[PDB]
Design a protein around this ligand. Sequence first.
Ligand SMILES: [Mg+2]
Ligand SMILES: [Mg+2]
Ligand SMILES: [Mg+2]
Ligand SMILES: [Mg+2]
Ligand SMILES: [Mg+2]
Ligand SMILES: [Mg+2]
Ligand SMILES: [Mg+2]
Ligand SMILES: [Mg+2]
Ligand SMILES: [Mg+2]
Ligand SMILES: [Mg+2]
Ligand SMILES: [Mg+2]
Ligand SMILES: [Mg+2]
Ligand SMILES: [Mg+2]
Ligand SMILES: [Mg+2]
Ligand SMILES: [Mg+2]
Ligand SMILES: [Mg+2]
Ligand SMILES: [Mg+2]
Ligand SMILES: [Mg+2]
Ligand SMILES: [Mg+2]
Ligand SMILES: [Mg+2]
Ligand SMILES: [Mg+2]
Ligand SMILES: [Mg+2]
Ligand SMILES: [Mg+2]
Ligand SMILES: [Mg+2]
Ligand SMILES: [Mg+2]
Ligand SMILES: [Mg+2]
Ligand SMILES: [Mg+2]
Ligand SMILES: [Mg+2]
Ligand SMILES: [Mg+2]
Ligand SMILES: [Mg+2]
Ligand SMILES: [Mg+2]
Ligand SMILES: [Mg+2]
Lengths: 50, 80, 49, 115, 48
Amino acid sequence: NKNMEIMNTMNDKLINKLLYKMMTLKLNNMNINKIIMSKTINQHSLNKLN
Amino acid sequence: SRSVWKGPNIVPLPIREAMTKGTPIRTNARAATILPQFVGLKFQIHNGKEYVPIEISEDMVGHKLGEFAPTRKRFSYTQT
Amino acid sequence: GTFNNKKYLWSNINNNYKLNYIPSNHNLYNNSNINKNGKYNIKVKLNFI
Amino acid sequence: MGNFRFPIKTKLPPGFINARILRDNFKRQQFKENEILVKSLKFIARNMNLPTKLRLEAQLKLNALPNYMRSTQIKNRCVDSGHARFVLSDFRLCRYQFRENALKGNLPGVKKGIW
Amino acid sequence: GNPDILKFRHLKTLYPDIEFVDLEEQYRLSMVEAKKRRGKGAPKKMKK
RNA sequence: GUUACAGACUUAAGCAGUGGAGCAUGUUAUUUAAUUCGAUAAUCCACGACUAACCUUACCAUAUUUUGAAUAUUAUAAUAAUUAUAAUUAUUAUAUUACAGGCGUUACAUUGUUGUCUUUAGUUCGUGCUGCAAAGUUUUAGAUUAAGUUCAUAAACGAACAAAACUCCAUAUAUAUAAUUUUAAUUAUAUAUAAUUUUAUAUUAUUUAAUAUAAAGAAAGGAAUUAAGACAAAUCAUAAUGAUCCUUAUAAUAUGGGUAAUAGACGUGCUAUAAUAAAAUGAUAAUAAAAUUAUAUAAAAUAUAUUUAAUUAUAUUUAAUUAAUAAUAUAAAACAUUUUAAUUUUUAAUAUAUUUUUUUAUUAUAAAUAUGAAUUAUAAUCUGAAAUUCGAUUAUAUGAAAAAAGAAUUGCUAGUAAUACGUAAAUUAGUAUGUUACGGUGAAUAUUCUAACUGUUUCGCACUAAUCACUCAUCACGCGUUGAA
Ligand SMILES: [Mg+2]
Ligand SMILES: [Mg+2]
Ligand SMILES: [Mg+2]
Ligand SMILES: [Mg+2]
Ligand SMILES: [Mg+2]
Ligand SMILES: [Mg+2]
Ligand SMILES: [Mg+2]
Ligand SMILES: [Mg+2]
Ligand SMILES: [Mg+2]
Ligand SMILES: [Mg+2]
Ligand SMILES: [Mg+2]
Ligand SMILES: [Mg+2]
Ligand SMILES: [Mg+2]
Ligand SMILES: [Mg+2]
Ligand SMILES: [Mg+2]
Ligand SMILES: [Mg+2]
Ligand SMILES: [Mg+2]
Ligand SMILES: [Mg+2]
Ligand SMILES: [Mg+2]
Ligand SMILES: [Mg+2]
Ligand SMILES: [Mg+2]
Ligand SMILES: [Mg+2]
Ligand SMILES: [Mg+2]
Ligand SMILES: [Mg+2]
Ligand SMILES: [Mg+2]
Ligand SMILES: [Mg+2]
Ligand SMILES: [Mg+2]
Ligand SMILES: [Mg+2]
Ligand SMILES: [Mg+2]
Ligand SMILES: [Mg+2]
Ligand SMILES: [Mg+2]
Ligand SMILES: [Mg+2]
């Protein structure tokens, strides 16, 4: 079902943004260590996502 | 609804009050089919800009109201 | 350095194209941070033998 | 009213929000909500066998239904951007936006059409 | 899409320990502050 | 507004067209309350837009929203989930400011991307060497290639981004797999191998290179890729961002109207102007490919248009399949019989006969059709809640112009052009004369002269934001200085 596939890839794209947002931390407004991350790659097996 | 079956197009209007007492019906429908139940009722059909006063004769019975309120102005050329 | 690969030039191994337009060995990317002056970006392109 | 644009409080879609997108989404939700009812009304209207008064009433009801109940009103927007021209259904994206995504490798199986 | 998707707001709810930073929001706030400073801030909204 | 060569769909042949007609569509102009905005020399003009009824839309008229789509701050209150009648959290409600929002303005602030030069052959970097040096050599004598492409020669030797090659499609062969009912094995698809073909005899010019001949091979294309720079080329209307402007309005929602207005004009197309060409028909259904079908594809069959029935169009109702299995869908030109006005180049009455779907004789048969399909009238049908502005069919009537088109001009060298040859999908609830794709049948022609435009080159150069360059004098405006008198 291609609708479902489209929905999945949308979800994946949205999660990527969320991950990017998470990646930057703060330490009591002293140090802002910006962890750089690659674009995520989502492996959709029948059983599980990775 | 154009097709003879299913027709004709009907819209809700303040018809009965107009029939009782001559108060014109300001329609913004333009796609309501005229009926035999309103010939001799004053309609004020929308033109996009301004509402257009019309008294529905018996020749109009088949047609739409928007057919009698011409939306565009009559074209001319400024010969310069 | 260089962006041609010489492993494909004289051997049985052939080059392949990712999405049918990027030589496998290449990997291209950009990221566009906003400045005080406005928008800018930073293309990077590595070869990897 | 003041607190919301449309009558019913619907959620915002995730990712790229736009005014037109918002308008479309709400409309789609209302269509989904009132799909069966509309169908039933249509059926009652287009019936040679049923009583005529009932069919007329159904037709009137259909006419009086709002802008957001209409299936025909729905327009497929781009999801990444908010464009509504050359919107491909197989990846709910606009033409340029689709191409951009495709070349990046975002699409699941899309690649350059070499022949 | 799925309207219930994780947002930056939630990333505080789920993981209070980690002091996250939403970069785009922070940038927007900085721009607003700059506008306020140089007399190009938004006019106060009418209520009536 | 220069020199010299070389190049190709540049020109020349050739084939089909445009330019005339009507229609479609885009543009212009003008109109309009609004005719939304952009694209507008090559490098705009079926372009952005793979479908403007409402929506989409951004425009206009009238209505009505004002923390609104977000994030955070500060408070009251209510409901639900979890725990062992209380509490913790999550949300919602009412407010509260900062704001949110802006297809508003500037691609002469930007990003990314794209067009043209360009699949053109250019664009540079090391170490060495030359020059006081900026620089030059490398990056070229001369030739050659499609080509900074190999030769060669050279103070050079290597190396990079381009070129080529690897890539994809298609081809040939091999292996594997398919219990040959998902079969098409004449296939599909993974993995290889294969060629930018090889060899030899001769004939011209200098060991090689072009022609010819021969023997060995399936061996012959297309696609993607379009560098640096430039054009302040296109885009702030995919999207994002700088600056700037709007904040009861330049933000937000509904109802209707507009984007479809029409004097002239300009592109692209479509249909035509009839016999090397149009129409009827063709069921042991002549012959394809590619692609779509859970926001569906709709078979058979019944009914009406229609006395048989077929065809075509609707309705009735869903068989099968979400697919190598069923459906869209018996491909169409082709080929065959029949007909065809202009055409007294035919018909029909007689005879006639070894041309009989026919012949001869004698009588009568006296510039748009039995071309074309614009325009309009009425009736139905389809989609949709809705078809008036403003959609698509079918029927019965209506039957304009147009007699192969002035100067000029467009595409194309082969499975190409051409085709009154059809087929599919993307965009839709609904409408393709457009777009993107598939096969079918399949040619004609050929290089020497000149315009242009790309390369590299000759000579010139007072230009270097580089000819939208630089630059000369009067006249006009002010403030000095020095002459004459
Ligand atoms: Mg729609
Ligand atoms: Mg010619
Ligand atoms: Mg003309
Ligand atoms: Mg013409
Ligand atoms: Mg325009
Ligand atoms: Mg412009
Ligand atoms: Mg065009
Ligand atoms: Mg509207
Ligand atoms: Mg607006
Ligand atoms: Mg702002
Ligand atoms: Mg740019
Ligand atoms: Mg050179
Ligand atoms: Mg040099
Ligand atoms: Mg078989
Ligand atoms: Mg190449
Ligand atoms: Mg370039
Ligand atoms: Mg520019
Ligand atoms: Mg410009
Ligand atoms: Mg801007
Ligand atoms: Mg603009
Ligand atoms: Mg925007
Ligand atoms: Mg407004
Ligand atoms: Mg238009
Ligand atoms: Mg003909
Ligand atoms: Mg046949
Ligand atoms: Mg059938
Ligand atoms: Mg089948
Ligand atoms: Mg005719
Ligand atoms: Mg005539
Ligand atoms: Mg015809
Ligand atoms: Mg063909
Ligand atoms: Mg050359």
